[PDB]
Scaffold this motif. Structure first.
Motif, PDB file in Angstrom:
ATOM      1  N   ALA A 264      65.356  49.900  17.323  1.00 32.06           N
ATOM      2  CA  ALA A 264      64.510  51.000  17.736  1.00 32.06           C
ATOM      3  C   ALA A 264      63.854  50.690  19.060  1.00 32.06           C
ATOM      4  O   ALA A 264      63.799  51.550  19.948  1.00 32.06           O
ATOM      5  CB  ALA A 264      63.442  51.264  16.674  1.00 32.06           C
ATOM      6  N   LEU A 265      63.360  49.462  19.211  1.00 30.38           N
ATOM      7  CA  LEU A 265      62.558  49.101  20.380  1.00 30.38           C
ATOM      8  C   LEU A 265      63.421  48.782  21.596  1.00 30.38           C
ATOM      9  O   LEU A 265      63.070  49.149  22.729  1.00 30.38           O
ATOM     10  CB  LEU A 265      61.670  47.898  20.053  1.00 30.38           C
ATOM     11  N   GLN A 266      64.532  48.081  21.396  1.00 28.01           N
ATOM     12  CA  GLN A 266      65.285  47.527  22.519  1.00 28.01           C
ATOM     13  C   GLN A 266      66.487  48.351  22.923  1.00 28.01           C
ATOM     14  O   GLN A 266      66.991  48.167  24.035  1.00 28.01           O
ATOM     15  CB  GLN A 266      65.751  46.091  22.193  1.00 28.01           C
ATOM     16  N   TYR A 267      66.954  49.243  22.041  1.00 30.73           N
ATOM     17  CA  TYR A 267      68.113  50.084  22.320  1.00 30.73           C
ATOM     18  C   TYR A 267      67.803  51.552  22.076  1.00 30.73           C
ATOM     19  O   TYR A 267      68.728  52.367  22.076  1.00 30.73           O
ATOM     20  CB  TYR A 267      69.315  49.656  21.473  1.00 30.73           C
ATOM     21  N   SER A 268      66.512  51.895  21.947  1.00 33.19           N
ATOM     22  CA  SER A 268      65.942  53.181  21.536  1.00 33.19           C
ATOM     23  C   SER A 268      66.781  53.939  20.516  1.00 33.19           C
ATOM     24  O   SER A 268      67.095  55.120  20.700  1.00 33.19           O
ATOM     25  CB  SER A 268      65.688  54.065  22.756  1.00 33.19           C
ATOM     26  N   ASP A 269      67.135  53.257  19.437  1.00 36.24           N
ATOM     27  CA  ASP A 269      67.889  53.849  18.339  1.00 36.24           C
ATOM     28  C   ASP A 269      67.004  54.761  17.496  1.00 36.24           C
ATOM     29  O   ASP A 269      66.008  54.320  16.930  1.00 36.24           O
ATOM     30  CB  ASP A 269      68.470  52.718  17.501  1.00 36.24           C
ATOM     31  N   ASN A 270      67.382  56.043  17.386  1.00 30.73           N
ATOM     32  CA  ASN A 270      66.546  56.989  16.658  1.00 30.73           C
ATOM     33  C   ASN A 270      66.744  56.903  15.152  1.00 30.73           C
ATOM     34  O   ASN A 270      65.823  57.207  14.399  1.00 30.73           O
ATOM     35  CB  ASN A 270      66.845  58.405  17.139  1.00 30.73           C
ATOM     36  N   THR A 271      67.941  56.527  14.690  1.00 30.56           N
ATOM     37  CA  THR A 271      68.112  56.290  13.257  1.00 30.56           C
ATOM     38  C   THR A 271      67.275  55.119  12.809  1.00 30.56           C
ATOM     39  O   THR A 271      66.637  55.170  11.753  1.00 30.56           O
ATOM     40  CB  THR A 271      69.571  56.040  12.939  1.00 30.56           C
TER      41      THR A 271
ATOM     42  N   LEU B  54      72.344  59.474  10.369  1.00 27.66           N
ATOM     43  CA  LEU B  54      72.590  59.475  11.803  1.00 27.66           C
ATOM     44  C   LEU B  54      71.996  60.729  12.426  1.00 27.66           C
ATOM     45  O   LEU B  54      72.069  61.824  11.855  1.00 27.66           O
ATOM     46  CB  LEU B  54      74.078  59.388  12.096  1.00 27.66           C
ATOM     47  N   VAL B  55      71.381  60.557  13.593  1.00 31.44           N
ATOM     48  CA  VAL B  55      70.746  61.689  14.264  1.00 31.44           C
ATOM     49  C   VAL B  55      71.363  61.807  15.654  1.00 31.44           C
ATOM     50  O   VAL B  55      72.574  61.628  15.800  1.00 31.44           O
ATOM     51  CB  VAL B  55      69.213  61.539  14.257  1.00 31.44           C
ATOM     52  N   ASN B  56      70.565  62.130  16.687  1.00 29.69           N
ATOM     53  CA  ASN B  56      71.167  62.390  17.995  1.00 29.69           C
ATOM     54  C   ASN B  56      71.585  61.127  18.726  1.00 29.69           C
ATOM     55  O   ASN B  56      72.471  61.190  19.574  1.00 29.69           O
ATOM     56  CB  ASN B  56      70.212  63.179  18.886  1.00 29.69           C
ATOM     57  N   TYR B  57      70.926  59.998  18.487  1.00 25.89           N
ATOM     58  CA  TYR B  57      71.232  58.825  19.304  1.00 25.89           C
ATOM     59  C   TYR B  57      70.979  57.605  18.435  1.00 25.89           C
ATOM     60  O   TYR B  57      69.837  57.357  18.051  1.00 25.89           O
ATOM     61  CB  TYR B  57      70.374  58.789  20.564  1.00 25.89           C
ATOM     62  N   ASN B  58      72.036  56.869  18.106  1.00 28.19           N
ATOM     63  CA  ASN B  58      71.822  55.789  17.158  1.00 28.19           C
ATOM     64  C   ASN B  58      72.841  54.719  17.466  1.00 28.19           C
ATOM     65  O   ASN B  58      73.734  54.412  16.648  1.00 28.19           O
ATOM     66  CB  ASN B  58      71.973  56.271  15.736  1.00 28.19           C
TER      67      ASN B  58
END
Ligand SMILES: *C(=O)[C@@H](NC(=O)/C(=N\OC(C)(C)C(=O)O)c1csc(N)n1)[C@@H]1N=C(C(=O)O)C(=C)CS1
Length: 260
Positions: free
Chosen positions: A99-106, A75-79
């Motif tokens: 990643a693409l639709q919810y800009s999940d960084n993990t 887990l990072v800053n926004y996941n």
């Protein structure tokens, strides 16, 4: 041109630095504003990562179904999505959509790991003819978007040309390019950015980015009705490290472009 005068005025009113690149695929004409200046990509680099995994799937035909473990250390800053699956797994398709639709960084970090590190994303960019893109870092708890920092940057012209090749062109295989288009069309984070400045009869697929220095980005493929598609890249960054997001500037850029 008339469009560049209005974009220059928008930039002046904004207090920041705006970069725009439009490709009209009807006749391959381009409109550029600071099109060859470097901007921090922030999360818009997730499209390249997802595309690079899609490219791997042209050989590993069931790769998108492959399960990936999500662990607390991931887990990072926004996941927002990956956090729902800690101590379980997500498929590479699910990670790509997150990643693409919810800009999940993990989710982005798992795509990068599947490619062997950020140099695997950059390599894919080079393989499809993008010499400008460079991805240097995975997502961490402390990401940056620092002026002058060459890491994790591209130019508007280069990103528009790459986005064109990945979605409208054939840099990806047939089912892969359709999958990428579906994911981009389903993005949930772009309602206030390019989409807000465009006629509602136009279909949009987009990926946003946001970061320090008030960096506010969006890259989009646009399908007007009865008219060849457009590619539009809007990058924006500000002089103060703690500047607020300005998604309205991207909306206004898109509105200026659409009028022209
Ligand atoms: C992509 O742009 C991502 N952005 C970040 O992870 C960054 N900051 O995220 C917030 C949540 C604001 C934070 O301060 O932790 C960041 C800072 S410097 C840099 N390179 N990235 C994700 N994408 C979006 C998006 O616009 O799609 C967000 C809304 C933030 S998370």
């Amino acid at each position: 041109s008339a469009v560049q005068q209005k974009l220059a005025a928008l930039e002046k009113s904004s207090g920041g630095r705006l970069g725009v690149a439009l490709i009209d695929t009807a006749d391959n004409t381009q409109v550029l504003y600071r099109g060859d200046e470097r901007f921090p990509m922030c999360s818009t680099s997730k499209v390249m990562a997802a595309a690079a995994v899609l490219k791997q799937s042209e050989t590993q035909k069931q790769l998108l179904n492959q399960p990936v473990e999500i662990k607390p250390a991931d887990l990072v800053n926004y996941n927002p999505i990956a956090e729902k699956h800690v101590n379980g797994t997500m498929t590479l398709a699910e990670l790509s959509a997150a990643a693409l639709q919810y800009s999940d960084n993990t989710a982005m970090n798992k795509l990068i790991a599947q490619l062997g590190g950020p140099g695997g994303v950059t390599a894919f960019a080079r393989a499809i003819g993008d010499e400008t893109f460079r991805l240097d870092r995975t997502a961490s708890t402390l990401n940056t978007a620092i002026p002058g920092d060459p890491r994790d940057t591209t130019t508007p012209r280069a990103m528009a040309q790459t986005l064109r090749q990945l979605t409208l062109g054939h840099a990806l295989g047939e089912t892969q390019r359709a999958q990428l288009v579906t994911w981009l069309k389903g993005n949930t984070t772009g309602a206030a950015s390019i989409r807000a400045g465009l006629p509602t009869s136009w279909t949009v697929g987009d990926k946003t980015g946001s970061g320090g220095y008030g960096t506010t980005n969006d890259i989009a493929v646009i399908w007007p009705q009865g008219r060849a598609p457009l590619v539009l890249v809007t990058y924006f960054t500000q002089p103060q490290q703690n500047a607020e997001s300005r998604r309205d500037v991207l909306a206004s850029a898109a509105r200026i472009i659409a009028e022209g």
